[PDB]
mmCIF file of C-alpha atoms and ligand atoms in Angstrom:
data_model
loop_
_atom_site.group_PDB
_atom_site.id
_atom_site.type_symbol
_atom_site.label_atom_id
_atom_site.label_comp_id
_atom_site.label_asym_id
_atom_site.label_seq_id
_atom_site.Cartn_x
_atom_site.Cartn_y
_atom_site.Cartn_z
ATOM 1 C CA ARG W 52 0.300 0.267 0.071
ATOM 2 C CA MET W 53 1.382 2.989 0.734
ATOM 3 C CA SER W 54 3.841 3.678 3.745
ATOM 4 C CA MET W 55 5.728 6.885 4.213
ATOM 5 C CA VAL W 56 8.985 8.032 5.918
ATOM 6 C CA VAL W 57 9.881 11.933 6.223
ATOM 7 C CA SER W 58 13.273 13.980 6.120
ATOM 8 C CA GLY W 59 14.807 17.343 6.960
ATOM 9 C CA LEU W 60 11.086 18.791 7.878
ATOM 10 C CA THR W 61 10.430 20.549 11.382
ATOM 11 C CA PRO W 62 7.625 19.363 13.871
ATOM 12 C CA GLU W 63 4.657 21.482 12.302
ATOM 13 C CA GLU W 64 6.009 20.357 8.705
ATOM 14 C CA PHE W 65 5.769 17.309 10.128
ATOM 15 C CA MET W 66 1.856 17.748 11.632
ATOM 16 C CA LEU W 67 0.995 18.185 7.691
ATOM 17 C CA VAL W 68 2.295 15.159 6.620
ATOM 18 C CA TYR W 69 0.470 13.310 9.271
ATOM 19 C CA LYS W 70 -2.691 15.541 8.529
ATOM 20 C CA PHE W 71 -2.008 14.253 4.626
ATOM 21 C CA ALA W 72 -1.476 10.615 5.819
ATOM 22 C CA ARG W 73 -4.854 10.370 7.900
ATOM 23 C CA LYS W 74 -7.037 11.717 4.970
ATOM 24 C CA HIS W 75 -5.691 9.565 2.760
ATOM 25 C CA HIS W 76 -4.964 6.191 4.822
ATOM 26 C CA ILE W 77 -1.275 5.912 4.367
ATOM 27 C CA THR W 78 0.677 4.665 7.131
ATOM 28 C CA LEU W 79 3.454 7.316 8.557
ATOM 29 C CA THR W 80 6.097 6.188 10.374
ATOM 30 C CA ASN W 81 9.758 7.051 11.689
ATOM 31 C CA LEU W 82 12.202 4.312 10.133
ATOM 32 C CA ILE W 83 12.626 3.436 6.441
ATOM 33 C CA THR W 84 12.216 0.173 5.637
ATOM 34 C CA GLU W 85 12.025 -2.347 2.413
ATOM 35 C CA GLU W 86 8.104 -1.915 2.878
ATOM 36 C CA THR W 87 7.951 2.064 2.788
ATOM 37 C CA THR W 88 6.812 3.461 -0.881
ATOM 38 C CA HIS W 89 7.574 6.898 0.044
ATOM 39 C CA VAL W 90 10.106 9.086 1.346
ATOM 40 C CA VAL W 91 9.282 13.109 1.717
ATOM 41 C CA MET W 92 12.096 15.071 1.242
ATOM 42 C CA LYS W 93 12.113 18.920 2.220
ATOM 43 C CA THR W 94 13.404 21.006 -0.808
ATOM 44 C CA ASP W 95 13.675 24.312 -2.028
ATOM 45 C CA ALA W 96 11.299 25.390 -5.132
ATOM 46 C CA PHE W 97 13.191 20.341 -5.929
ATOM 47 C CA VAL W 98 16.572 19.742 -4.252
ATOM 48 C CA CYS W 99 17.535 18.486 -1.090
ATOM 49 C CA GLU W 100 19.736 17.863 1.626
ATOM 50 C CA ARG W 101 21.629 14.274 0.894
ATOM 51 C CA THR W 102 20.338 11.950 3.657
ATOM 52 C CA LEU W 103 20.002 8.474 4.585
ATOM 53 C CA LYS W 104 16.688 8.226 4.234
ATOM 54 C CA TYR W 105 17.225 10.069 0.775
ATOM 55 C CA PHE W 106 20.200 7.326 -0.384
ATOM 56 C CA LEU W 107 18.023 4.457 0.913
ATOM 57 C CA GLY W 108 15.081 5.677 -0.915
ATOM 58 C CA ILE W 109 16.634 6.034 -4.178
ATOM 59 C CA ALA W 110 18.543 2.951 -2.993
ATOM 60 C CA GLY W 111 14.878 1.353 -2.631
ATOM 61 C CA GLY W 112 14.184 2.735 -6.025
ATOM 62 C CA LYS W 113 11.241 4.892 -3.920
ATOM 63 C CA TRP W 114 9.208 7.643 -4.474
ATOM 64 C CA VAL W 115 11.690 10.048 -3.237
ATOM 65 C CA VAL W 116 9.231 13.419 -3.307
ATOM 66 C CA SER W 117 9.674 16.557 -2.224
ATOM 67 C CA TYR W 118 7.514 17.912 0.491
ATOM 68 C CA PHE W 119 5.522 20.262 -1.959
ATOM 69 C CA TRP W 120 3.605 17.186 -2.999
ATOM 70 C CA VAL W 121 1.968 17.179 0.419
ATOM 71 C CA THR W 122 1.483 20.577 1.219
ATOM 72 C CA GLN W 123 0.088 21.300 -2.584
ATOM 73 C CA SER W 124 -2.239 18.321 -1.908
ATOM 74 C CA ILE W 125 -3.815 19.665 1.118
ATOM 75 C CA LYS W 126 -4.357 22.841 -1.013
ATOM 76 C CA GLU W 127 -5.912 21.437 -3.729
ATOM 77 C CA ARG W 128 -7.862 18.531 -1.344
ATOM 78 C CA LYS W 129 -6.683 15.243 -3.084
ATOM 79 C CA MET W 130 -3.717 13.292 -3.924
ATOM 80 C CA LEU W 131 -1.760 14.618 -6.525
ATOM 81 C CA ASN W 132 0.913 12.485 -8.457
ATOM 82 C CA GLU W 133 4.253 11.973 -7.575
ATOM 83 C CA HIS W 134 5.124 12.092 -10.623
ATOM 84 C CA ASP W 135 5.210 15.962 -11.042
ATOM 85 C CA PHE W 136 6.773 16.274 -7.286
ATOM 86 C CA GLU W 137 9.676 13.568 -7.434
ATOM 87 C CA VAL W 138 13.569 15.253 -6.441
ATOM 88 C CA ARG W 139 15.664 16.050 -8.900
ATOM 89 C CA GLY W 140 19.281 16.500 -7.016
ATOM 90 C CA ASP W 141 21.363 18.024 -4.003
ATOM 91 C CA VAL W 142 25.253 18.821 -3.685
ATOM 92 C CA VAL W 143 26.319 15.664 -5.993
ATOM 93 C CA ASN W 144 23.618 16.702 -8.416
ATOM 94 C CA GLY W 145 22.805 20.276 -8.780
ATOM 95 C CA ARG W 146 18.779 20.950 -9.868
ATOM 96 C CA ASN W 147 17.833 18.573 -12.606
ATOM 97 C CA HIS W 148 20.252 15.127 -12.630
ATOM 98 C CA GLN W 149 17.822 12.769 -12.369
ATOM 99 C CA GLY W 150 18.663 10.631 -9.310
ATOM 100 C CA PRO W 151 15.626 8.797 -7.734
ATOM 101 C CA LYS W 152 14.182 8.871 -11.646
ATOM 102 C CA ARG W 153 16.927 6.534 -12.822
ATOM 103 C CA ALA W 154 16.205 4.350 -9.704
ATOM 104 C CA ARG W 155 12.312 3.807 -9.671
ATOM 105 C CA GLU W 156 13.098 2.793 -13.600
ATOM 106 C CA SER W 157 16.168 0.883 -12.981
ATOM 107 C CA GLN W 158 15.618 -2.619 -10.900
ATOM 108 C CA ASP W 159 16.627 -4.615 -13.561
ATOM 109 C CA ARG W 160 20.247 -2.925 -14.291
ATOM 110 C CA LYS W 161 21.325 -2.113 -10.829
ATOM 111 C CA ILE W 162 24.439 0.236 -10.466
ATOM 112 C CA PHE W 163 26.539 -2.254 -8.419
ATOM 113 C CA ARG W 164 25.134 -5.288 -10.746
ATOM 114 C CA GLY W 165 27.297 -8.203 -9.984
ATOM 115 C CA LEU W 166 29.765 -6.362 -7.200
ATOM 116 C CA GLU W 167 31.605 -7.418 -4.130
ATOM 117 C CA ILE W 168 32.032 -4.591 -2.175
ATOM 118 C CA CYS W 169 33.558 -4.191 1.434
ATOM 119 C CA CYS W 170 32.998 -1.376 4.070
ATOM 120 C CA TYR W 171 36.773 -1.605 5.617
ATOM 121 C CA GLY W 172 37.743 0.139 8.675
ATOM 122 C CA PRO W 173 35.506 2.644 11.042
ATOM 123 C CA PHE W 174 32.980 4.761 9.410
ATOM 124 C CA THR W 175 31.105 7.813 11.034
ATOM 125 C CA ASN W 176 27.999 9.477 9.864
ATOM 126 C CA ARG W 177 26.755 6.532 7.874
ATOM 127 C CA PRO W 178 26.935 3.817 9.846
ATOM 128 C CA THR W 179 28.752 0.589 8.278
ATOM 129 C CA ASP W 180 25.867 -1.539 8.130
ATOM 130 C CA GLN W 181 23.543 1.254 6.644
ATOM 131 C CA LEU W 182 25.894 1.342 3.927
ATOM 132 C CA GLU W 183 26.193 -2.240 3.600
ATOM 133 C CA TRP W 184 22.500 -2.139 3.196
ATOM 134 C CA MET W 185 22.486 0.675 0.599
ATOM 135 C CA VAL W 186 25.263 -1.054 -1.204
ATOM 136 C CA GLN W 187 23.071 -4.208 -1.244
ATOM 137 C CA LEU W 188 20.096 -2.616 -2.135
ATOM 138 C CA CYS W 189 22.101 -1.558 -5.292
ATOM 139 C CA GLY W 190 22.811 -5.221 -6.374
ATOM 140 C CA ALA W 191 26.240 -6.019 -4.728
ATOM 141 C CA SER W 192 27.180 -8.334 -2.363
ATOM 142 C CA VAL W 193 28.408 -7.564 0.970
ATOM 143 C CA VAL W 194 31.814 -9.322 2.213
ATOM 144 C CA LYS W 195 32.877 -8.587 5.611
ATOM 145 C CA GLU W 196 36.727 -9.296 6.057
ATOM 146 C CA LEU W 197 38.881 -8.328 3.311
ATOM 147 C CA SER W 198 40.259 -11.889 2.677
ATOM 148 C CA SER W 199 36.603 -12.864 2.206
ATOM 149 C CA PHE W 200 36.338 -11.977 -1.869
ATOM 150 C CA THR W 201 35.527 -14.257 -3.824
ATOM 151 C CA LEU W 202 38.361 -16.310 -5.748
ATOM 152 C CA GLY W 203 36.239 -16.121 -9.179
ATOM 153 C CA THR W 204 36.443 -14.123 -11.905
ATOM 154 C CA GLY W 205 32.916 -12.952 -12.529
ATOM 155 C CA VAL W 206 33.400 -10.702 -10.034
ATOM 156 C CA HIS W 207 35.170 -7.288 -8.733
ATOM 157 C CA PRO W 208 36.448 -6.654 -5.548
ATOM 158 C CA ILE W 209 35.713 -3.112 -4.285
ATOM 159 C CA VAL W 210 36.929 -1.484 -0.736
ATOM 160 C CA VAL W 211 35.242 1.222 0.299
ATOM 161 C CA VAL W 212 37.059 3.321 3.221
ATOM 162 C CA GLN W 213 36.055 6.407 4.962
ATOM 163 C CA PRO W 214 39.324 8.412 5.718
ATOM 164 C CA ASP W 215 38.420 10.520 8.157
ATOM 165 C CA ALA W 216 37.496 8.241 10.802
ATOM 166 C CA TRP W 217 40.754 6.422 11.219
ATOM 167 C CA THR W 218 43.836 7.335 13.229
ATOM 168 C CA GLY W 219 41.464 2.791 7.198
ATOM 169 C CA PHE W 220 44.945 3.006 5.729
ATOM 170 C CA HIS W 221 47.014 3.038 2.437
ATOM 171 C CA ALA W 222 48.143 -0.331 3.363
ATOM 172 C CA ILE W 223 44.908 -2.220 2.228
ATOM 173 C CA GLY W 224 46.575 -3.141 -1.326
ATOM 174 C CA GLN W 225 49.344 -5.135 1.166
ATOM 175 C CA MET W 226 46.003 -7.294 2.603
ATOM 176 C CA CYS W 227 44.251 -7.820 -1.277
ATOM 177 C CA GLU W 228 44.060 -7.404 -4.223
ATOM 178 C CA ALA W 229 41.261 -4.761 -4.633
ATOM 179 C CA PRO W 230 40.973 -1.275 -5.965
ATOM 180 C CA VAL W 231 40.781 1.026 -2.819
ATOM 181 C CA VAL W 232 37.894 3.564 -2.884
ATOM 182 C CA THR W 233 36.845 6.501 -0.419
ATOM 183 C CA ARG W 234 32.955 6.196 0.828
ATOM 184 C CA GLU W 235 32.405 8.990 -1.430
ATOM 185 C CA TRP W 236 32.056 6.607 -4.165
ATOM 186 C CA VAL W 237 29.337 4.788 -2.894
ATOM 187 C CA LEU W 238 27.624 7.938 -1.888
ATOM 188 C CA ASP W 239 27.848 9.435 -5.190
ATOM 189 C CA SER W 240 26.914 6.517 -7.141
ATOM 190 C CA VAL W 241 23.937 6.238 -5.273
ATOM 191 C CA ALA W 242 23.166 9.617 -5.177
ATOM 192 C CA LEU W 243 22.910 10.029 -8.852
ATOM 193 C CA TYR W 244 21.817 5.970 -9.419
ATOM 194 C CA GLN W 245 24.997 5.405 -11.956
ATOM 195 C CA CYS W 246 27.797 3.611 -10.914
ATOM 196 C CA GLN W 247 30.920 6.123 -11.122
ATOM 197 C CA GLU W 248 34.302 5.539 -12.888
ATOM 198 C CA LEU W 249 36.550 4.835 -9.551
ATOM 199 C CA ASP W 250 39.271 6.697 -10.966
ATOM 200 C CA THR W 251 38.248 10.095 -8.941
ATOM 201 C CA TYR W 252 37.931 8.249 -5.909
ATOM 202 C CA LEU W 253 41.019 5.305 -5.356
ATOM 203 C CA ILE W 254 43.210 5.650 -2.680
ATOM 204 C CA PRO W 255 46.769 5.727 -2.334
ATOM 205 C CA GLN W 256 47.783 2.058 -1.892
ATOM 206 C CA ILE W 257 51.691 1.595 -0.754
ATOM 207 C CA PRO W 258 53.675 -0.993 -2.443
HETATM 208 CO CO1 CO F 114 36.363 -6.797 -15.049
#
């Protein structure tokens, strides 16, 4: 049916979503799950802040719809089409790039097609498991330990790291034969719904 999650709103804005939820029998909740159909983002006149419910909503190929969908529907006294209120961007993508759009559609071809991803080392604003769930949702396979990468030709190993959090290293290459990228690779790739070329995110691996 319809399950809504909400992001970046104030209490008085949450209340309007609540009103809208009651009028149209839409379950409204706090946490985002697979069962959620809609993510309601706060936007400007339709770019939003990159949030966890934003990445996960896109990762699930959901309706990542601007808060304007609600108030306009409240004002026009019926459920408007999500189509005309869907979010277009953030800071990885200004105004137009169609992150959520590529995603609602593409579910056949997922950006992390046949990939083995390892979120290695400490992580901060984005928990290891949230990045893992994100990465899984885009079609990848999660590896927990560097030595657990499949010894088979068909998959490509990637090591995702968040530099700031440690005090990972430049010595991952010493423990495995995988490209090591910064977590921004995952975040952008998901934001934009297009697998980013590892090139700009690769980290110095010391021989
Ligand atoms: Co290849």
